[PDB]
């Protein structure tokens, strides 16, 4: 968001339902209400949360699933290959 606004305190149940991912909120609580509001708003899911990737079978964006870790390139040093 950073047209004035005030800081808001909201519980976990209410804060989790307000996440930008619609299938995550659907898999949490009240699947029907989330789907109806998401279909109307024509929402789109970036598929960047970790529960989303779990549902579709992707690597979770955490631990060994982070890009900087999975795209590593492993080769022996020029010195090593020679010594054999």
């Amino acid at each position: 968001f950073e047209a004035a606004g005030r800081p808001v305190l909201m519980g976990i149940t209410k804060a989790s339902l307000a996440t930008d991912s619609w299938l995550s909120a659907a898999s949490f609580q009240e699947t029907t209400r989330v789907l109806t509001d998401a279909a109307i708003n024509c929402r789109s899911d970036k598929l960047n949360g970790l529960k989303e990737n779990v549902i579709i079978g992707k690597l979770i964006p955490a631990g060994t699933g982070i890009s900087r870790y999975r795209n590593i390139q492993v080769q022996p040093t020029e010195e090593a290959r020679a010594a054999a």
Binding site: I12, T13, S16, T19, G49, L50, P61, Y69
Partner: protein, 306 residues
């Protein structure tokens, strides 16, 4: 170690027969106060409970004075391996006051112990508190699991994304303003937001340090009381949080790795307890859900006289 359990090893203290009668006699006199009528009936139970729940402590110390320090049952508890002194008191001595199904303490105590064996009525009365406690631990797991699930879902996407966000914001830990009871959970394992300064004066611990145990004592020596510390509350990281703000990983004992999913770790760290919570799970849910407090308390809207 030659640690076994036997009938002999469970010894009843000999100061217990007199002690009850001493406290028993204090009950016929409050019966005089009830028979006199100067005090109400609920006050009769109250004065009865306070005197009876005192005798429990007297037989407690009485029991301990009699036991030899090498008694196998006491050795089990002394070592910290397993057991409670409350359980030992219920084994030999007296059970004490038990719960009524409605929840109020019975004025009548169970003078017998499971060593001497309870009677028909003494055993029956105890079933109320024994079953009611066994059903409390039955639905305790269902509410804790539902709480853990909401914790996980609200925090699952929180992971460390960068080594440092370079922010200078932080929070002040109390740190022994004698030592504070809980600096292990508040000051220990944090990273300094700013340099630790002594008057006027000397810098004893530089910022961006892990605050190990030796740091505390050294700090503690300098006469400092408070410290500004990095926290995920003030972390300015665009996505997730940074390693310096989160601090040490409790498992590795070192700076948190980059990929760590601390949101789930937190939801589980808070979720595993709650089976031990008995002022409990309701209050914890009220806080995280941010509901209007059960019994609202006012806060000052401005500083001044009252």
């Amino acid at each position: 170690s030659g640690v076994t359990v036997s009938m002999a090893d469970v010894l009843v203290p000999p100061q217990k027969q007199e002690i009850l009668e001493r406290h028993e006699a204090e009950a016929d006199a409050i019966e005089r106060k009830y028979q006199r009528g100067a005090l109400n009936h609920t006050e009769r139970n109250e004065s009865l409970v306070k005197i009876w729940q005192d005798a429990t402590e007297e037989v407690g110390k009485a029991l301990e004075e009699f036991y030899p320090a090498d008694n196998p049952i006491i050795t089990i508890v002394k070592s910290g391996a397993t057991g409670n002194l409350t359980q030992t008191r219920t084994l030999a001595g007296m059970k004490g006051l038990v719960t009524n199904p409605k929840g109020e303490f019975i004025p009548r105590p169970i003078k017998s112990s499971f060593r001497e064996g309870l009677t028909v009525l003494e055993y029956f009365i105890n079933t109320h508190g024994a079953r009611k406690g066994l059903a409390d631990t039955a639905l305790r797991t269902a509410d804790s699991g539902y709480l853990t699930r909401r914790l996980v879902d609200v925090s699952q996407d929180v992971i460390v994304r960068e080594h440092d966000c370079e922010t200078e914001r932080g929070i002040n830990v109390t740190l022994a303003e004698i030592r504070d009871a809980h600096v292990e959970t508040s000051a220990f394992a944090r990273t300094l937001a700013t340099d630790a300064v002594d008057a006027n004066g000397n810098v004893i611990i530089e910022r961006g340090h892990d605050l190990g145990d030796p740091a505390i004592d050294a700090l503690l020596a300098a006469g400092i009381t408070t410290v500004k510390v990095r926290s995920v509350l003030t972390c300015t990281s665009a996505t997730g949080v940074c390693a310096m703000c989160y601090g040490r990983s409790m498992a590795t004992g070192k700076l948190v790795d980059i990929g760590e999913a601390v949101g789930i770790v937190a939801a589980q760290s808070i979720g595993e307890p709650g089976t031990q919570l008995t002022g409990g799970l309701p209050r914890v849910q009220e806080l995280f859900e941010a509901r209007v407090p059960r019994n609202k308390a006012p806060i000052a809207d401005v500083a001044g006289r009252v």
